[PDB]
Amino acid sequence: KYSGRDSLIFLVDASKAMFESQSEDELTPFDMSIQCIQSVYISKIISSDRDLLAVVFYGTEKDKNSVNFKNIYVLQELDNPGAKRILELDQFKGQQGQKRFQDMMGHGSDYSLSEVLWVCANLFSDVQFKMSHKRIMLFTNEDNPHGNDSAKASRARTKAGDLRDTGIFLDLMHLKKPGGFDISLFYRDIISIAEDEDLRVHFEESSKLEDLLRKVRAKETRKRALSRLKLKLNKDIVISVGIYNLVQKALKPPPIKLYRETNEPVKTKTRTFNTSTGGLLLPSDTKRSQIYGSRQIILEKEETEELKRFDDPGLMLMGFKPLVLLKKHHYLRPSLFVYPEESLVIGSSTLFSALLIKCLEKEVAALCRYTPRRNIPPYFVALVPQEEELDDQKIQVTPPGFQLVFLPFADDKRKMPFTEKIMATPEQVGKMKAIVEKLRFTYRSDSFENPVLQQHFRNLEALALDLMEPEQAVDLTLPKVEAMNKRLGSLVDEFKELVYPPDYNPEVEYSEEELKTHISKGTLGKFTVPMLKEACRAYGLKSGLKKQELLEALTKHFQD
Amino acid sequence: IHWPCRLTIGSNLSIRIAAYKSILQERVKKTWTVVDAKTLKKEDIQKETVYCLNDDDETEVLKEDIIQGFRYGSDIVPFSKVDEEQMKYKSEGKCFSVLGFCKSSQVQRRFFMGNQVLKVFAARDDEAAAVALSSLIHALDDLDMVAIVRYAYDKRANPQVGVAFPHIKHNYECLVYVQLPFMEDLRQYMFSSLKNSKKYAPTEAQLNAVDALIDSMSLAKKDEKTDTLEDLFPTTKIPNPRFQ
Amino acid sequence: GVRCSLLRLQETLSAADRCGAALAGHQLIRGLGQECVLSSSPAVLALQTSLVFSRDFGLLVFVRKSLNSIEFRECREEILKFLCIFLEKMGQKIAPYSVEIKNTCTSVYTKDRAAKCKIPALDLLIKLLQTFRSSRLMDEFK
């Protein structure tokens, strides 16, 4: 489960009608499919760069597969997506790309539709790793590949059923072409996802291919426990729970140092070097230290970690508090999640479920002392009972359990300056209400993307596929100032006149002698910090950052 | 410390604002300095990163011969410090623009981020923008719904979205800012239901016992019956014991 | 043991798609080494060093020739498991070509960034197992 990696095999048609299309600005379906596969590759390499992807063109004149089969070509075998794999594919884009494919692969050469499915299963069966999921998209612009030969259709159906039984779920992303037919036909009993749809006969547009939301270039999928703690209701009765995190800040992967001449990673070696007398030092002759004024406090390494140990790792329950006492203002860390686990203590789930039921029945939240690791000071936590919420599609959006809420200490609360309470009046609060109602918004969690991360990922894509210019991300968090201004209307000016007063716009060179004379002159004035710093550095005296440091040191030493 | 900015709606509606810092995790200012155990002097100690090649070590590899590199797939694409500074996201300085307004039920305490909370109070002592801001927060509070905000600290700092709840008290009146999660910032997990399960369904006796337990260890008494939840031991006023 | 070791296993680290055939190399190195049970005039003590440890087509040098092979750095680890326990024969007083094999083991130590209990703790038993059976020539080790 945890160590399994999802796997994907594309299946691009290369028929004659697959290439030739309507003569307009619309993309030929082959270019559309290649662009979509390239987009899927790009999305899946930045996000979860461990899955396996491979592309198997069928209908070609050439042939390359583990078992010799006519008109089936495996351009790439199952492996992690790579930049070279993307660049090996973009050469087929455009009319020149179409001609390159025709001269390098071919088209026509009527296929069987069964040996291709067998080949896909072969690569699926050739992997020495785990197989979390197995999927096969079938990019095709035709819906009735056969019909003049029922035997081939029956063989294809049998092979598809065998693949489904093995655990292979194929879903074709149908391509629309001029004409009037993309009918639900000899593909319906083959789609092993069997996605729910109206199954309307007279489709007249591209099928579920825009559903890719092409290039969702930000994701890092993972599920892990992150801790396994004991919840002590008392000294002797303890239960075992896991501490998951539902939302966590996303950061770009750290950079790697490289050797310029060879462009290969350079290993680093941090070690405390000699005391200007030669040799190396022990973790046993280097004690930690701190200085406060003229007093130096010398303290050993282990004693440094000894002074921040209070409790053994676990959640010590200390009582229940009403939910109405958990103010929204107080907040320090992202809220964690607790689920009952039964690996260290058997029977924790039953007590946990009873506690959850009777804790959200009385609208109370458990209060505990939280110590995640061995030597961390305790931190109080209010376990808010989060009841399971489910959609009509039987999809879990808020899984049941307890949610940590880090209550801040009094040290972590800052005090505001005194401000004078000035209240508004009617007849402009109403105007504000009208503006707000005119600016409705159904906020969703899947609304915005980190612009910095998006720009960095696009820059990396441009630097790995020489796109000749980075893709400019549409900054989704940028307000639509012109659209919202036009939607607002002139009532903003009515607001402005109503409250704002009419007059309210809202909108070296130094040496020995000059310093010797200046210390008696006593200014050291227009003398800037940048030039005091360079004087003290080039001369060799000890230097700091605050002005008074240099102003005292130079004055005391230069004369005395 | 003061943090001036301007909350803007549309293009011409701007209110001078001042977001003071609020609840934020606070650490210890001083630091532990490694010192040799022979003369209690930091100057004798000395540490430095020494980049070394991979094949049969080397004499040295200098600083000036090192360039950045970012993993991208199974290989490495050589970026550089100057290229990062040149082609990257560029905002327009500190901004507190308002994307829109959503019901104060589509944001939940679970979907919060950041290590800090802000309290966007008002402008300075001039009581011109204060009236407009108070009108905005009152319109948000007497009615429902809450304001989403695009907030950025400086030109270099990344821009972040968030929520600005109204917050009215008998002494002051202001909004409060907390960061929201981005699309890549969100993680969805699959957990077994704790109510439909049959193995762990607790019997009536267990339910009554735990009900009596939580009623015994309640940390709040409805004293004087004045509809006031007088609080027992509260954890938001105890100083951090670690520092003491 | 068999003279065809060069032909059979030096071909392995010459072709592309190094993912795979690591088990083939493991079978080859088990076959060349199942013959190590014989003790009546092996006549290969001086043969192995010029073949498995030489700078030209050796196998301990197949770390300098494995650096770029990340896929053949843990497979190389798994074959060199047996390649490095191959020295497990403490019934000989011979010490030919041990001087350079010492620094070869040192290089193996200072080469692999991972498998630190698999490539190391598997090398440097040449020390305390093969070396320090010495102080009769002792030219460079100390």
Distance of CA A68 to the CA centre of its chain: 42
DSSP state letters, A171-201: E--B---SSS---S-TTTTT-SS-------S
Q: Which residue of B has its CA nearest to A381?
A: B235
Contact at CB, B56 and C67, closer than 8 angstroms: no
In A239-320, which ranges are continuous DSSP H helix? Answer: 301-306
Q: How far apart (Å, rounded) are the C-alpha atoms in residues A11 and A15? A: 12
B112/A334 Cβ within 8 A: yes
**B63 and A CB contact within 8 Å:** no
User: Do A329 and B176 lie within an 8 Å CB cutoff?
Assistant: yes
User: Looking at the complex, does the CB of residue A489 fall below 8 Å from at least one CB of chain B?
Assistant: no
Which chain A residues contact residue B173 at CB under 8 A? 421, 423
- With an 8 Å Cβ cutoff, are B56 and C107 in contact? yes
Of A333, A445, A495, the CB nearest to B181: A445
CA distances from A40 to A51, A82, A192, A212, A492 (A): 12, 12, 21, 8, 45
Q: For residues A339 and A245, what is the distance between their CA atoms, to the nearest angstrom?
A: 11
Residue A93 annotated to the active site: no
Contact assignment for B51 to A298 by CB distance below 8 Å: no
**C-beta atoms of C64 and B56 within 8 A:** yes
Eight-class DSSP state of A337: E
B contacts of A380 (beta carbons < 8 Å): 235, 238
Resolved by: cryo-EM
Element (H, E) at B96: strand B95-102
Please count the other Cβ atoms lying within 10 Å of the Cβ belonging to residue A66: 12
Chain A segment 103-162 residues within 8 A of B by beta carbon are none
CA dist B115 and B108 (Å) reads: 17
Contact list, B57 vs chain C (CB under 8 Å) = 110
Asked if residue B161 lies in contact with residue B151, where contact means CB atoms within 8 angstroms, the answer is: yes
Catalytic option among A1, A223, A267, A546: A1
Which residues lie below 8 Å from residue A343, measured CB to CB, with a gap of 6+? A228, A240
Specify the 3-state DSSP secondary structure of A309: coil
Please, which residues 92-121 of chain B have a Cβ atom closer than 8 Å to chain A?
97-103, 106-107, 109-113, 115, 117, 119, 121
Q: Which residues contact A15 (CB under 8 A, 6 or more apart)?
A: A59, A107, A108, A141, A142
What the block records as the tokens of B19 is 């977001």
* Share of chain C residues as helix, strand and coil, in percent rounded to the nearest 5: 45, 0, 55
A:453-472 residues touching chain B, CB 8 A cutoff: 453-456, 459-460, 462-464, 470
Which of B61, B101, B168, B184 would best serve as a mutation to test chain A binding (most A beta carbons within 10 A)?
B184
Tokens, residue B134: 């108070």
Backbone angles phi, psi at B75, to 5 degrees: -115, -175
| H-only helix segments in C10-133 | 22-34, 45-52, 71-85, 98-109
Residue in A172, A178, A174 with CA at minimum distance from that of residue A156: A172
Listed resolution, Å: 3.6
In this structure, the dihedral spanned by the alpha carbons of residues A290, A292, A293 and A297, taken in order and rounded to 10 degrees, is: -50
Helix or strand or coil: residue A513?
helix
Amino acid at A40: V
Q: Which residues of A fall within a CB distance of 8 Å from B136?
A: 432
| Residue A401, amino acid | G
Residues 6+ apart with CB under 8 A from A335: A246, A247, A384, A403, A404, A405, A406, B109, B110, B112
Which tokens belong to B69? 């590199």
Instruction: Report which secondary-structure segment, H or E, holds A240.
Output: strand A238-245
d(CA A423, CA A415): 22
Compute how many other C-beta atoms are within 10 angstroms of the C-beta atom of residue C46. Answer: 12
Q: Which domains does chain A have, with CATH numbers?
A: 5-220 (3.40.50.410), 221-248+312-409 (2.40.290.10), 249-311 (4.10.970.10), 410-504 (1.10.1600.10), 510-560 (1.10.720.30)
Q: Which subunits have 3 or more CB–CB pairs within 8 Å of chain C?
A: B
> What is the C-alpha end-to-end distance of chain A, expressed in Å?
75
Residue of C nearest to B58 (CA): C110
CB A338 within 8 A of CB A242: yes
Half-sphere exposure of A178 (CA within 13 A, CB side): 10
Partners of residue C64 in chain B, C-beta under 8 Å = 55-56
Phi-psi region of A555 (alpha: psi -120 to 50; beta: other; left: phi over 0): alpha
Three-state DSSP class for residue A438: coil
Q: How far apart (Å, rounded) are the C-alpha atoms in residues B125 and B169?
A: 19
The alpha helices in chain B, defined as continuous H runs, are 81-86, 129-142, 204-216
Report the candidate in A38, A30, A114, A34 with the shortest Cα–Cα distance to residue A71. A114
What is the pairing mode between strands A258-259 and B13-24?
unpaired
Long-range contacts of A32-35 (CB under 8 A, 24+ apart): A32/A175, A32/A206, A32/A209, A33/A139, A33/A175, A34/A89, A34/A90, A34/A92, A34/A93, A34/A97, A35/A93
- Flag if C67 and B54 touch (Cβ within 8 Å): yes
CB B161 within 8 Å of CB A478: no
d(CA B32, CA B30): 7
Q: Provide the phi-psi class of A318: left if phi over 0, else alpha when psi is between -120 and 50, else beta.
A: alpha
Distance from the A486 Cα atom to the nearest Cα atom in chain B, whole angstroms:
9
Chain B hits for A310, CB-CB cut-off 8 Å, are: 241
Query: Residue-wise over B88-99: b if at least 16 C-beta within 10 A, else e?
Result: ebebeebbbbbb
What is the per-residue DSSP string for A19-70?
Answer: H---SSSSPPHHHHHHHHHHHHHHHHHHS-TTSEEEEEEES-SS-B-SS--T
CB B163 within 8 A of CB B177: yes
DSSP state of A208: T
What letter would DSSP give residue A453?
H
Q: Looking at CA atoms only, how far is residue B74 from chain C in angstroms?
A: 10
Q: Does A507 contact B6 at a Cβ distance shorter than 8 Å? A: yes
Helix (H) or strand (E) holding B18: strand B13-24
Distance of CA C120 to the CA centre of its chain: 13
- The torsion angle over the Cα atoms of residues A269, A272, A274 and A276, rounded to 10 degrees, is 110
Which residues are registered as beta bridge partners of A271?
B48
Neighbours of A534 (CB within 10 A): 15
